[PDB]
């Protein structure tokens, strides 16, 4: 039942008495385990004996914290001008990639498939590739068609390079259109690997025949890798402009993922121009801002472009941003802008104002390897303890480097780093190690729910930082890098602490002796 | 045809002019203009064909159709995405197939279980990994009732035999372990995953209780093809028990393995999604002699038609009961129509969804005085297009598996007042300034089925069509 | 007791057994009313019966939502270069004014008193003034000493203008130090009145005798009025630079309220220069961005400076930002910048993307008159209903214009506007009209707690927008004006809605059928 | 003096050179360097003088001492800020004088009641307004035990008579209605507000239960002058009760009218804050023959000295109980010193607070191996500087009512490792790069009294002093 003046959606409609009885009555027909048994099993999953069994897994994966290569290749491709991502292979993949980015960015995502089916499974997808490049060119008129693969095309061994060579010899795709390509096998690496593989494809396509000279142009190239905060592309362009140091981001989807709602759909908008990618080899140097995933990128820079590839850390937090600015200054010969020094000092001030609420807080965190490394380093700088650090797609060399950095800090003494482990592993850790909060993406909401069900004292609240963020709006517009980004982070961490403390102290007559007005 | 039908045939020619001539001629056969006289589409439209490469279709794969649509929703079973990590991740909790239960303990729908294939598994195969996986699953998730294995693209291509694994594990576990060969390259869309899933249910589940004692009633029924999106199947089930029927099972929104095994004991199968679950309904009519019928719980007109035609399968008692259910919700339905009809009447709607909703929601829109000017499906078959003809006005554009190019070009020309479609279309049309409602996930709202749903539907359509923000697309100085 | 590894602060130390027992024992010594009697009286304070009694008050004020004049004067004064706020009167006031801003901005606040004591009711405070200006000069070396007054001095009737002319003539203070003054009685109007009276003193001191010519300088002046979000000062300069229209904020404290923590204390930073104030009459016009409180400032612009004082609404929301920009374009003859059109269209896209969660949501809000009118307007533009609207310091003219705006909108049909009411009145309206959410300053946390004590079903969650904000950190850095500020308000509102909906659906096995991953 | 004392005497001369001649010669008598051989300050320092005009003193006013400090905390009485709006608004819930109770129902400390003078009240007086005000309070807040009227500046200036109102309203309600003439222009600081408040307690509260029965015990005490900042009074009372005493009243943190009325029946008054409540302790000694003693519950050395001295006023059972209580907490004290003393010893501290804390926390810093290099008060009297003298090393700068300018100059020159002071000083010194702890509000932590407080205290000094941010004030290219 509904009233005309008080329409309820699903929640809280199903809380009504009639549906609670419907549920009670449906339950007799499902042969449900009894309540007591389900409670016993739930409690058992919160214990250290269960955690032990959970860490014995060697085959089963439950609630992974990573996606497949081609997703990353699509995102890299979207960052170049007038580019259409094209995933050679099965069409279900593309429907999913588009949806996954649609829900995080709340924006339209252009990507096509060449729809390989059972017929292509025996003949190979060459006819699909020819006809697919022809149709895509006609309908969508891109300057660039950026080709990646699905797992079906990888398993059958489609010879991508030969297929596109035929399409161009045989007139399926005009000579005007560039067609960079990369193999992006889903059963290797993750979405961050696909981004790097796609980047490599663009470098080969646009500069493999150039005779470059580092420093012909007095600029720096910046490479982000897989990055889903629009603010981070914009902050880097802003900081470089304040340094007065020419710069090109190589792959920048921040304009096509933020077009205006003005009556017109714009498929293409902004992005790195062909001129920016072709003149890359003449820059002073290219800085690879997520080092752990830009592996093939680092080889382009050093081996193809003969540039230094000056190591930099992800520019997250106060010391990593100082290091990026010092690197830009010493490579460029230009002084750090007073506006950037001023900004630094404002961030320091925020850190000092808020240090008594963060000091000694214990956090669990998960995400991609560069992000986790940078966030962990910044928590250490804040006097916080990153007690449970997980990166499902990190490798052992990354884990050694994490442990070295934790070992050198007072705040990393109780910290444990886990790779090749998923969110069901992370759930056990939240019940066993009980940090104060957890930092992660929207899949973390299910762990917060599970911890709360053990009790209000066991709840570990989620702080949303990462990808994907599907259950809050417009967090993709934030910045997490540079000093602007560090201010956002500090602000999110200390207000998470305060919101949780106000909740804990808001019981009238019971815990509100400490419901203070001033914090 | 009428003037509208002529403008629409001329729009069709114009839109298709951009396509290379082989694809143009193939796409011409996927669109037509309706005729109210027509009972069958005949040669006028073709469908369920492969998609044209490179056109940005909205279609998904067989895996989506099997794991995502049919088996995913069964709460008491764990579903294993067998293959590389992607498919299960993207489909993890995207579809609002509501259920109640204790997630990870007695209900497993929002968990993503996967065998995360690495290059070693492609090289030497995954059946040993899968067997071990099932052992670990049994240990860590003891309350499952059953386990399904949804194959992703590489499984079939590498020569794996999951049916041996499934038989072997089931005997060791003593619970149904069901193998689905729903690799995404099979078929042309989600639709073949439905069919594969129905045949798996016919062979591995449905007979499990044959000859077992089951206490029946004369009013036993099964709801078939209702995936409880936003609690739609709960909003349908409350009315069928309010009419005096006993809903012994729901397929598969908030459904269990036990309910599916009990289904062969009912008196009647009520099929809501024809497209996905007509195969098993037809099978239960052939083999168990259970009759079935299609119904439609969208809006007060279709609800009252369905309730009366279902209750005419039983006797005067249930027939009376239908009349008393309908009369008791009348006042509710009248005040919803009074309030929201005036706000909505006369506005024009373009619909484009999967395989059932584009025709099924028409009556609810017409109960609010709105008109459909274009209706399309991603993957319906010719029998769905047959089933659409009666509900369309003369000259309506009726089309199949449209590219994004086509969908935008129909919208810009027809200038609908409102569009109902999916998430992949939503943010395009919103930038074009066309009010849009997500008609797969109900835009995080619903339910829309049944009497409680119609009030939510009406409120939602009004909220979006008449929002103040749609007047602000153009800066005032322009 | 405390354990060494896990030291507990006040909460939750006082939850331990030993303290619960200590409290049980102390209560026998207080002659406490019976818990049942207390709960009966709580329950009664939540009813309509009590609300009727509460709204019959004529003499008692409970939890006011306004402050006194001199607070406003101090804030106005801080916005001028090398200025030292000086409050002639009693020193208790100045401790309180510095504290109040310290806790909102988390920054140092320079203000001085002349410490008037019992000797001045009979003798006047001329001696205090003479010595106070001499000492303030010597210690702090200002260029400007901005003189306002406490209520003691108002009652007493001290003649500031005379005392100041006697201080320079006798040599207590140097003649090249500028000494603007204003009477700021606390028993008239509120802190917004004080800001406007202080601004009229500055304009008299720097422009009284000037032969101005509007349009001699092709610039616009902007006057914000009492405004405590740093971001709003910054966004206005940023938009004016994009428009390419020269501009001066007259009173801009954003630099002195945000100095860096770099090893030095700087008492003075940035702020409106004396040149800018002296040349103010030659601008094309002066825009008064909070019109309801800038009453005397309007007389300055119009009567002293002979400028139009083009009327503009507070630039909060889409439509009021459009209006401000067309007004700047009309007065300057310059076009609206393309990057502003782009930002406007990204705001529209945000409002379209989040419309379904906000439409039809009911809000209670309170604050200052201009703030509350501007936020009400923008809530109406989003399709939300401001059902309970309160401004303690607002007048009947403002109330009439509010009801006019509300009666014109489809979304203002159930809206009730209250003036000269306080937060104890607001607390009764939250219990009887129960909006979904309330918008207000930190004092609203006590109402949230009270509505949560009646039951989880009746809790009205606070959304923090306004002043002061004491129980969260760094919110004073945000923006609420322009398109950038409207993006902040939209994201805050929709995420508050989704935070509450997540909380309500997070009960494992009971309400978590609607605990959706995607929203 | 020694080489520190000499450096400090030249520092004094160097900081006072900026003052105009009148002021400079006056401000020189408000500083001194300490000499361990002196037992009273004599002529070396003057204090409790009027503030120099315009120097940016830290001091507040009489209303702050009376409403803010003494009466504000009593949770069972509603306290009316009588005057214009500003005062009660700035002081609403800013001091963490903790209490337990149901806010606005049986406890009223975080509500701001005020007569909100408008111009009409100034011109025509506010006495009729105040009388109506109290009638509205009784209707809407029926569980108060009593009502206090805290006068703001204008009240005495316009000729109001609040004693007449209180008397008339107290008969009418039949509850104490207490009038306080704590207008902010009286006195030079918060200090006279204390004195005015104790004098009101003396006449309107303390005699209320005279002649009436009370079941007394031999171990009955009152805690005088502990405002339960962060629950300090509770962390103190626990030890007194564990020693076997019965804490009949606490003044006034978590304090009630009832407890204050029962105070005249105690056996011993225990004064923590000498400055604010010595007046009433002295009067109860003279009128009721109740001895009183100062004590200090900051840090393990002071707590054990206080417990022993307090127990020594009773008999052998309580002397034994003091020894047991010390013994029970010795393991917790040892673990705190072992963990935090190494992280803090050697470090220098500068303290600047109101009227008690600048001397009272020194033993706690000294238990953590820290040294105080300068100590000042805002509004203390010469008897407070006398009590500070035993706890200072030779040549320590000791000062009174310093301007912001002076404090800044003292910090720049002395370069303390840590500063403890108030909210008005905090953000200036953090920008200078000096670790700072709020030593009035405990920087929203605490309690710091008692054995439980000392743990928190040590954790908090370590947190701020050794925080890693302190190393980043200088950009690394600078
Ligand atoms: S697009 Fe239904 S045949 Fe299938 S997930 Fe949507 S119109 Fe599907 S009704 Fe159903 S619950 Fe659906 S909305 Fe048949 S199940 S493959 Mo996308
Ligand atoms: S500044 Fe206490 S004589 Fe008074 S409010 Fe703090 S050093 Fe006061 S101990 Fe006390 S609880 Fe105080 S910390 Fe005497 S009450 S006028 Mo500011
Ligand atoms: S010294 Fe003390 S705090 Fe000052 S007024 Fe006097 S009692 Fe009060 Fe009050 S209303 Fe505002 S803050 Fe003042 S100007 Fe008057
Ligand atoms: Cl890695
Ligand atoms: Cl007003
Ligand atoms: Mg968008
Ligand atoms: Mg259940
Ligand atoms: Mg600060």
Distance from Cα A106 to the centre of ligand 6, integer Å:
4
B332 HSE (CA, 13 A, CB side): 20
Q: Where are the beta strands (DSSP E) in A101-151?
A: 112-113, 144-149
For D230, the closest chain A residue by CA position comes to A514
From the list A348, A512, A518, which residue is nearest D469 (CB)? A348
3-state secondary structure of C246: coil
- Give the position of tokens 């007394």: D216
Atom of ligand 2 nearest to the CA of D380: 3
Are B462 and B367 found together in one domain? yes
What's the residue count for chain B? 478
C112 and D84 in contact by Cβ < 8 A?
no
Q: Which DSSP letter does residue A460 get? A: -
For ligand 1, atom 13, the nearest C-alpha belongs to: B440
**C449, C474, C492, C514: best to mutate for the A interface, most A CBs within 10 A:** C474
Our mutation pick for probing the ligand 3 site, out of D65, D87, D119, D162, counting the most ligand atoms within 8 A of Cβ, is D87
Q: Which DSSP letter does residue A334 get? A: P
Tokens of C314: 């507070």
| Euclidean distance between CA atoms B420 and B373, whole angstroms | 12
Spatial contact of A167 and A49, defined as CB atoms under 8 Å apart: no
Are D376 and D412 found together in one domain? yes
Quick check: is C111 catalytic? no
| Euclidean distance between CA atoms B465 and B463, whole angstroms | 6
For ligand 1, atom 7, the nearest C-alpha belongs to: B354
Are B77 and B200 found together in one domain? yes
- Axis-axis angle for helices D300-311, D450-465 (nearest 10): 160
| Euclidean distance between CA atoms A86 and A182, whole angstroms | 11
Q: Residues of C352-363 as b/e, b for ≥16 C-beta within 10 angstroms? A: bbbbbbbbebbb
With a CB cutoff of 8 Å and minimum separation 6, the contacts of D203 are none
With a CB cutoff of 8 Å and minimum separation 6, the contacts of A287 are A220, A221, A222, A223, A310, A312, A324, A327, A328
Q: Please give, rounded to a whole number of angstroms, the shortest distance from the CA of C40 to a CA of chain D.
A: 10
CA-atom Rg of chain D in angstroms:
23
B468 and C382 in contact by Cβ < 8 A?
yes
A421 is in an annotated binding site: no
- Axis-axis angle for helices A396-407, A369-382 (nearest 10): 0
For residue D180, being part of any structural domain is answered with: yes
Are D54 and D76 found together in one domain? no
B460 vs C contacts (CB less than 8 Å): 356
From the list B441, B445, B469, which residue is nearest C348 (CB)? B469
For ligand 2, atom 3, the nearest C-alpha belongs to: D355
For C449, the closest chain D residue by CA position comes to D103
For residue B418, being part of any structural domain is answered with: yes
> Can you give the three-state secondary structure of chain B, one letter per residue?
CCHHHHHHHHHHHHHHCCCCHHHHHHHHCCEEECCCCCCCCCCCCCCCCCCCCCCCECCCCHHHHHHHHHHCCCCCEEEEEECCCHHHHHCCCCCCECCCCCECCCECCCCCEECCCCHHHHHHCCHHHHHHHHHHHHHHCCCCCEEEEEECCHHHHHCCCHHHHHHHHHHHHCCCEEEECCCCCCCCCCHHHHHHHHHHHHHHCHHHHCCCCCCCCCCEEEEEEECCECCHHHHHHHHHHHCCCEEEEEEECCCCHHHHHHHHHCCCEEECCHHHHHHHHHHHHHHCCCCEEECCCCHHHHHHHHHHHHHCCCCHHHHHHHHHHHHHCHHHHHHHHHHHHHHHCCCEEEEEECCCHHHHCHHHHHHCCCEEEEEEECCCCHHHHHCCHHHCCCCCEEEECCEHHHHHHHHHHHCCCEEEECHHHHHHHHHCCCCEEECCCHHHCCCCCHHHHHHHHHHHHHHHHCCHHHHHCCCCCC
- φ/ψ region of D350 (left if φ > 0, alpha if ψ in -120 to 50, else beta) reads beta
Tokens of D104: 């606005």
| D61 within ligand 3 shell (Cβ under 6 A) | yes
Spatial contact of A291 and A314, defined as CB atoms under 8 Å apart: yes
Distance from Cα B355 to the centre of ligand 1, integer Å:
6
Closest C-alpha among D151, D153, D154 to residue D123: D154
C207 HSE (CA, 13 A, CB side): 26
| Euclidean distance between CA atoms A26 and B84, whole angstroms | 36
From the list A353, A509, A517, which residue is nearest C473 (CB)? A353
Tokens of C92: 């208790």
| Euclidean distance between CA atoms C104 and D441, whole angstroms | 16
Domain stop point among B279, B302, B318: B318
- In angstroms, how far apart are the furthest CA atoms of chain D? 77
DSSP β-bridge partners for residue C87: C113, C148
Are D209 and D179 found together in one domain? no
3-state secondary structure of D150: strand
**C-alpha torsion B474→B475→B476→B477, nearest 10:** -120
Measure the CA angle with vertex D8, ends D5 and D14; round to 5°.
150
With a CB cutoff of 8 Å and minimum separation 6, the contacts of B145 are A31, B76, B77, B175, B176, B256, B257, B258
Alpha helices, DSSP H, located in C382-507: 396-408, 423-433, 445-454, 482-504
Handedness of CA A462, A467, A468, A469 (dihedral sign): positive
Are D18 and D43 found together in one domain? yes
| Euclidean distance between CA atoms B234 and B243, whole angstroms | 14
Pairing of strands B397-400, B31-33: antiparallel
Resolution reached, in Å? 1.9
Q: Which DSSP letter does residue C506 get? A: -
- Give the position of tokens 């005997």: B171
Distance from Cα C165 to the centre of ligand 3, integer Å:
26
| D190 within ligand 2 shell (Cβ under 6 A) | yes
For residue D333, being part of any structural domain is answered with: no
Closest C-alpha among B128, B116, B200, B141 to residue B169: B128
Are B53 and B32 found together in one domain? yes
DSSP secondary structure letters along A59-87: S-EES-S---HHHHHHHHHHTBTTEEEEE
Closest C-alpha among B64, B370, B8 to residue B193: B64
Spatial contact of B26 and B392, defined as CB atoms under 8 Å apart: no
Tokens of D196: 């005015």
Residue among B61, B166, B374, B380 flagged as catalytic: B61
| Euclidean distance between CA atoms D211 and B229, whole angstroms | 76
Residue ranges near ligand 4 (ion) with Cβ within 5 Å: A 292, 369, 394-395, 398
Phi, psi of D249 (to 5 degrees): -145, 155
B21 HSE (CA, 13 A, CB side): 0
For residue D334, being part of any structural domain is answered with: no
- φ/ψ region of D125 (left if φ > 0, alpha if ψ in -120 to 50, else beta) reads left
| Euclidean distance between CA atoms C229 and C105, whole angstroms | 9
Spatial contact of A114 and A88, defined as CB atoms under 8 Å apart: yes
- Axis-axis angle for helices A338-358, A482-504 (nearest 10): 20
| D440 within ligand 2 shell (Cβ under 6 A) | yes
From residue B221, how far is each of B276, B290, B310, B326 by CA, in Å? 18, 10, 10, 20
Q: Is there contact between C and D if contact means ≥3 C-beta pairs under 8 Å?
A: yes
Report C:352-371 residues touching B (Cβ under 8 A). Answer: 352-353, 355-357, 359-360
Any chains having at least 3 CB pairs less than 8 A from chain B are A, C
> Can you give the three-state secondary structure of C120-188, one letter per residue?
HHHHCCHHHHHHHHHHHHHHHCCCEEEEEECHHHHHHCCCHHHHHHHHHHCCCCCCCCECCECCCCCCC
Is residue B175 less than 8 Å (CB to CB) from chain A? no
| Euclidean distance between CA atoms A71 and B238, whole angstroms | 42
Alpha helices, DSSP H, located in A175-317: 191-207, 230-243, 274-278, 295-299
3-state secondary structure of D224: strand
| C193 within ligand 3 shell (Cβ under 6 A) | no
Atom of ligand 2 nearest to the CA of D68: 5
| Euclidean distance between CA atoms B200 and B277, whole angstroms | 12
For D449, the closest chain C residue by CA position comes to C10
Spatial contact of A135 and B19, defined as CB atoms under 8 Å apart: yes
3-state secondary structure of C321: helix
| Euclidean distance between CA atoms D260 and D277, whole angstroms | 13
| Euclidean distance between CA atoms D346 and D334, whole angstroms | 19
For D111, the closest chain C residue by CA position comes to C63
Handedness of CA A260, A264, A267, A270 (dihedral sign): negative
Long-range Cβ pairs for the range C175-178 (8 Å, 24+): C177/C133, C177/C137, C177/C142, C177/C143, C177/C144, C177/C145, C178/C143, C178/C144, C178/C145, C178/C205, C178/C206, C178/C274
| Euclidean distance between CA atoms C217 and C248, whole angstroms | 11
Closest C-alpha among C490, C191, C438, C72 to residue C321: C490
Q: Residues of B426-454 as b/e, b for ≥16 C-beta within 10 angstroms? A: bbbbbbbbbbbbbbbbbbbbbbbbbbbbb
From residue C256, how far is each of A122, C105, C227, C271, C280 by CA, in Å? 72, 11, 14, 7, 22
Tokens of A202: 């663009």
How was this model experimentally determined? X-ray
Domain total of chain B: 3
- Axis-axis angle for helices B330-344, B316-328 (nearest 10): 50
For residue B333, being part of any structural domain is answered with: no
- Provide, for chain C, the percentages of residues in helix, strand and coil under a 3-state DSSP scheme, each rounded to the nearest 5: 50, 10, 40
C473 vs A contacts (CB less than 8 Å): 350, 353-354, 357, 491, 494-495, 498, 519
D430 and A353 in contact by Cβ < 8 A?
yes
Q: Residues of C488-505 as b/e, b for ≥16 C-beta within 10 angstroms? A: bbbbbbbbbbbeebbbbb
DSSP β-bridge partners for residue D81: D114, D150
A297 is in an annotated binding site: no
Pairing of strands B397-400, B371-377: parallel
Q: Is there contact between D and B if contact means ≥3 C-beta pairs under 8 Å?
A: no
| Euclidean distance between CA atoms C136 and C82, whole angstroms | 13
Are D469 and D358 found together in one domain? yes
Alpha helices, DSSP H, located in D179-315: 190-204, 232-242, 257-262, 274-288, 300-311
Tokens of C199: 């601004």
Are D56 and D89 found together in one domain? no
Tokens of C2: 């405390």
Atom of ligand 2 nearest to the CA of D440: 13
Closest C-alpha among A445, A93, A424 to residue B112: A424
Tokens of D435: 């670790």
Task: For residue D14, count other CB atoms closer than 10 A to its CB.
Answer: 11
Are B193 and B220 found together in one domain? no
- Domains of chain A as residue ranges with CATH: 47-66+361-473 (3.40.50.1980), 68-208 (3.40.50.1980), 210-312+474-480 (3.40.50.1980), 317-360+481-519 (1.20.89.10)
The ligand whose atoms approach the alpha carbon of B296 most closely is 1
For residue D108, being part of any structural domain is answered with: yes
Our mutation pick for probing the ligand 3 site, out of C92, C153, C156, counting the most ligand atoms within 8 A of Cβ, is C92
Tokens of D291: 């001895």
Closest C-alpha among B64, B87, B56, B93 to residue B425: B56
Pairing of strands B292-294, B269-271: parallel
Our mutation pick for probing the ligand 1 site, out of B57, B58, B69, counting the most ligand atoms within 8 A of Cβ, is B69
- Give the position of tokens 């906000």: C358
| Binding-site residues from annotation of C for [8Fe-7S] cluster | 68, 93, 151, 186
- Axis-axis angle for helices B274-287, B191-204 (nearest 10): 30
Pairing of strands D146-151, A247-249: unpaired
- φ/ψ region of B462 (left if φ > 0, alpha if ψ in -120 to 50, else beta) reads alpha
Tokens of C95: 């401790």
Q: CATH number for the domain including D305? A: 3.40.50.1980
Atom of ligand 3 nearest to the CA of C187: 10
Pairing of strands C83-88, C112-113: parallel
Q: Which DSSP letter does residue D356 get? A: S
Are B379 and B312 found together in one domain? no
D424 and C109 in contact by Cβ < 8 A?
yes
Domain stop point among B204, B221, B251: B204
Spatial contact of C357 and C497, defined as CB atoms under 8 Å apart: yes
Is residue C19 less than 8 Å (CB to CB) from chain D? yes
Range of the domain at B265: 205-318
| Euclidean distance between CA atoms D101 and D414, whole angstroms | 45
**C-alpha torsion A382→A383→A385→A386, nearest 10:** 20
For residue B375, being part of any structural domain is answered with: yes
Q: Exposed (0-12), middle (13-18) or buried (19+): which is D278, by Cβ within 10 Å? A: buried
- Give the position of tokens 């490579």: A331
Are B36 and B81 found together in one domain? no
C381 HSE (CA, 13 A, CB side): 21
Alpha helices, DSSP H, located in D205-250: 232-242
For B403, the closest chain A residue by CA position comes to A139
In the sheet that B220-226 helps form, which strands lie side by side, from edge to edge? B246-252, B220-226, B269-271, B292-294
Distance from Cα B107 to the centre of ligand 7, integer Å:
8
Q: Which DSSP letter does residue A263 get? A: S
């Amino acid at each position: 039942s509904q009233t005309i003046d008080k329409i309820n959606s699903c929640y809280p409609l199903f809380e009504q008495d009639e549906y609670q009885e419907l549920f009670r009555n449906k339950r007799q027909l499902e042969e449900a385990h009894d309540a007591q048994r389900v409670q016993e099993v739930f409690a058992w999953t919160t214990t250290a004996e269960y955690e032990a069994l959970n860490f014995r897994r060697e085959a089963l994966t439950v609630d992974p914290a990573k996606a497949c290569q081609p997703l990353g290749a699509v995102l890299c491709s979207l960052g170049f001008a007038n580019t259409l991502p094209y995933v050679h292979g099965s069409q279900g993949c593309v429907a999913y990639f588009r949806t996954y980015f649609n829900r995080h960015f709340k924006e339209p995502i252009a990507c096509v498939s060449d729809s390989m089916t059972e017929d292509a499974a025996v003949f190979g997808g060459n006819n699909n590739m020819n006809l697919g490049l022809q149709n895509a060119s006609a309908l969508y008129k891109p300057e660039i068609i950026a080709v990646s693969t699905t797992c079906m095309a990888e398993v059958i061994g489609d010879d991508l390079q030969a297929f596109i060579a035929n399409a161009k010899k045989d007139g399926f795709v005009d000579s005007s259109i560039a067609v960079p390509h990369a193999h992006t096998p889903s059963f290797i690496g993750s979405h961050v690997t696909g981004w790097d593989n796609m980047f490599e494809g663009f470098a080969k396509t646009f500069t493999a025949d150039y005779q470059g000279q580092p420093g012909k142009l007095p600029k720096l190239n910046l490479v982000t890798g897989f990055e889903t905060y629009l603010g981070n592309f914009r902050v880097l362009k802003r900081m470089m402009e304040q340094m007065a140091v020419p710069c090109s981001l190589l792959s920048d989807p921040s304009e096509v993922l933020d077009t205006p709602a003005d009556g017109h759909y714009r498929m293409y908008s902004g992005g790195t121009t062909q001129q920016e990618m072709k003149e890359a080899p003449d820059a002073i140097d290219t800085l690879l801002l997520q080092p752990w995933q830009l592996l093939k990128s680092k080889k382009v820079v050093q081996e193809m472009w003969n540039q230094p590839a000056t190591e930099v850390a992800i520019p997250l937090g106060l010391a990593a941003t100082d290091e990026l600015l010092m690197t830009v200054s010493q490579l460029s010969g230009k002084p750090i802008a007073d506006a950037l020094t001023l900004e630094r000092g404002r961030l320091v001030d925020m850190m000092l104002d808020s240090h008594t609420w963060l000091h000694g807080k214990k956090f669990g965190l998960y995400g991609d390897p560069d992000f986790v490394m940078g966030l962990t380093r910044f928590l250490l700088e804040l006097g916080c303890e990153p007690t449970v650090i997980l990166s499902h797609n990190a490798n052992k060399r990354w884990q050694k480097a994490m442990n070295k950095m934790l070992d050198a800090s007072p705040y990393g003494r109780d910290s444990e780093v886990f790779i090749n482990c998923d969110l069901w592993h992370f759930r056990s850790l939240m019940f066993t190690r009980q940090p104060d909060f957890m930092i992660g993406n929207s899949y973390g909401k299910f762990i917060q729910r599970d911890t709360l069900a053990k009790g209000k004292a066991f709840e570990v609240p989620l702080i949303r930082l990462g990808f994907p963020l599907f259950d809050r709006h417009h967090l993709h517009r934030q910045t997490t890098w540079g000093y602007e980004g560090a201010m956002n982070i500090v602000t999110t961490l200390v207000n998470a602490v305060l919101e949780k403390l106000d909740s804990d102290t808001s019981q009238l007559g019971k815990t509100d002796y400490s419901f203070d007005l001033v914090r | 045809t009428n003037a509208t039908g002529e403008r629409n045939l001329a729009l069709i020619q114009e839109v298709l002019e951009v396509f290379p001539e082989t694809a143009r001629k193939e796409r011409r056969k996927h669109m037509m203009v309706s005729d109210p006289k027509m009972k069958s589409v005949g040669k006028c439209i073709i469908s369920n064909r492969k998609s044209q490469p490179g056109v940005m279709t909205v279609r998904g794969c067989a895996y989506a159709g099997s794991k995502g649509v049919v088996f995913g929703p069964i709460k008491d079973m764990a579903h294993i995405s067998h293959g590389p990590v992607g498919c299960g991740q993207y489909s993890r909790a995207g579809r609002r197939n509501y259920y109640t239960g204790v997630s990870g303990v007695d209900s497993f729908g929002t968990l993503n279980f996967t065998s995360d294939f690495q290059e070693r598994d492609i090289v030497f195969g995954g059946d040993k990994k899968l067997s071990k996986l099932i052992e670990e699953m049994e240990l860590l998730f003891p309350l499952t009732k059953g386990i399904t294995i949804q194959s992703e693209c590489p499984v079939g291509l590498i020569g794996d035999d999951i049916s041996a694994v499934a038989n072997a594990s089931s005997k060791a576990l003593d619970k149904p372990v069901i193998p689905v060969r729903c690799e995404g390259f099979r078929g042309v869309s989600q639709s073949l995953g439905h069919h594969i899933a129905n045949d798996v249910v016919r062979d591995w589940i449905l007979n499990n209780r044959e000859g077992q004692p089951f206490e029946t009633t004369p009013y036993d029924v099964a709801i078939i093809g209702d995936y409880n999106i936003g609690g739609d199947a709960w909003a349908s089930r409350i009315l069928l028990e309010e009419m005096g029927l006993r809903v012994v099972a729901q397929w598969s929104g908030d459904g269990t393995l036990v309910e599916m095994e009990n289904t062969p004991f009912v008196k009647l199968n009520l099929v809501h999604c024809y497209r996905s679950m007509n195969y098993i309904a037809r099978h239960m009519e052939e083999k168990h002699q259970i009759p079935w019928m299609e119904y439609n719980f969208f809006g007060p007109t279709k609800i009252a038609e369905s309730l009366r035609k279902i209750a005419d399968q039983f006797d005067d008692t249930i027939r009376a009961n239908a009349e008393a259910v309908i009369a008791r919700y009348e006042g509710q339905m009248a005040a919803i129509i009074a309030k929201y009809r005036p706000r909505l009447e006369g506005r024009k709607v373009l619909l484009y969804m999967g395989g059932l909703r584009p025709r099924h929601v028409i009556g609810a829109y017409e109960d609010l005085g709105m008109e459909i000017i274009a209706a399309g499906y991603e993957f319906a078959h010719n029998d769905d297009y047959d089933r659409t003809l009666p509900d369309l006005k003369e000259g309506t554009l009726l089309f199949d598996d449209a590219s994004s190019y086509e969908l935008e070009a129909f919208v810009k020309a027809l200038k609908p007042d409102l569009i109902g479609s999916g998430i992949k279309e939503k943010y395009i049309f919103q930038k074009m300034g066309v009010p849009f409602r997500q008609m797969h996930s109900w835009d995080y709202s619903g339910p829309y089925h049944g009497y409680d749903g119609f009030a939510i539907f009406a409120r939602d359509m009004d909220m979006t069509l008449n929002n103040p923000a749609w007047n602000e697309l153009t800066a005032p100085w322009l």
